[PDB]
Amino acid sequence: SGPVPSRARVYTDVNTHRPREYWDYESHVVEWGNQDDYQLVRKLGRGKYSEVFEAINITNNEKVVVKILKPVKKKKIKREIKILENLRGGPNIITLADIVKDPVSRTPALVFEHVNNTDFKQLYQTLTDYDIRFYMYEILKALDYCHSMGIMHRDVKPHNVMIDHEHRKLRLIDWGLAEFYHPGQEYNVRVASRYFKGPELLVDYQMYDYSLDMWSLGCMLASMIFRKEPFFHGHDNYDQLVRIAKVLGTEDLYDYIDKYNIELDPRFNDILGRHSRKRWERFVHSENQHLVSPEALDFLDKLLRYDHQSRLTAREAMEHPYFYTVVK
Template structure:
């Protein structure tokens, strides 16, 4: 069990801290960056390749001196002289806090909803990721931790290591495995047909594992996939919006990112289910196969996003689905009146993607990217689809590569 203690006066212990320094002034551009990126990990990974790591010896420096030298207001720490204790099943036992951030050598930066650090555990020399959540609903924090624990060891799911909360309950730290990720825009464009099949199969394995435990991720998108290509390792990360599915429960539709949101979420249908993740998966598969990311590009809002979907899947099926489930479109969708015929998948083939497309992937997409959420292919059934036949044996044999944490 890792118990973390962290202080804004962390510098006084004389450790060396590596802090990510973006090539632009973070303090001056932070507001613009946060406004432009709705989720912290989007900003983080978009900036990943532009990070210039700066090593500082801070044994005699104050936090203010460091912040000033980096032009960062709050580069280090989230709480003042508070101690972190392990969180087990949502409970905190302060007496069990027997280690602290002195055990870590830290590098990397900050996001809108969390501060995220790459760290080395000096006790075992293993690299990990420390995610310091900014003050949010403690219920949501406990849920994320519980879900990570529940999924621990599952195929292609980021490995949970530990969590801690300070004595005030205002700040929580989640520790997970580290993946040597390649920025997705660089990686995806270089994929061949076999690699698209391999990695989408591995993503499906993660989704199926979660769904088998009645867990919805609710934010599947490229930013939440880490791929260590040299080891053919994929991890589905960021379970902060995930939840347990109960068919008798209505869920918030304030989840996910627009380009990957299922139609039922776009129209505020609160009785959605696990199949919303499969829509997001289908969007990723289409984006990879057709080399068009995002595939459904609603530039402005949810209304425009639904129109972009209708331009591909047609309007007739949209309104048939709305009628079937007695879904009344919100007033904001009043201008969704144009009539669109359904397009066939081969219409999206061009010279850029011709080597990635085939009849099997067209069939798979036609069974996932459909309005009626009850008729979408499940993750388990999708894993058996012929599209994955050429890579299934290799993908299933591929080691899960879960890091064993040695303290």
């Protein structure tokens, strides 16, 4: 009875061996700056739970980005703030420059370093094979750092990866779904975009870890090197697993669910089917062949595995032959 437990292969006890104030974000006391330092220039995004603007810091004439926070639970304000403060200064981690609030409504706003992003739907089609390897290495620096600091991102995808291509400058943004990793903790599986959801989320395995970000990164890489957006095109959460099984095959899916004694939701019974494991070379075509190499396919093969434990860590990924041509 019950699923087999799992823990991260790396950085397992980072939070266990840190003081309570490091990870107990509900007790965090926010330090608030002066809202009047910042004036709004233009809207960048409007979700149900945030409004984001380009803004000017009128004290130093630098652009910043203002993220108005309106989450369903106020706990989540302190989670995003505490995680951003814990990770501040990490390689390729967006910098939280300030935290301000409306003196009247008390609506809080995060103030970030500005990145001169180009929408991925315009930028990615211009990147070369070296640019993808270079940007992927920058994201891996950010993920090995955040994992090393006890934090899972849980929302790795193009919309949360800012790139100022002119300055070869990448920042991993959007730490609002990020969580502190505690070995044995059962997490909400209702996290991440459907196309980037890992198999553990789809089969309701709650004892996941940093390895979830590595699957999300694999999905992002596959979409870039194959020019197939998204790579795993599910119509719903149940279909999403079927799209993954059409590539990775159903045999290895059953080895995964049996290793962890996972019970497959009955909704899978009639849509899963039976699928061979495909060769990654089947996804090469004239439009993408200039981005694909044996090293890229081997690297993708080692990220996109059902078993979260078997996936490369960020640091293992950084030592892969795909990044041999990338500085450090």
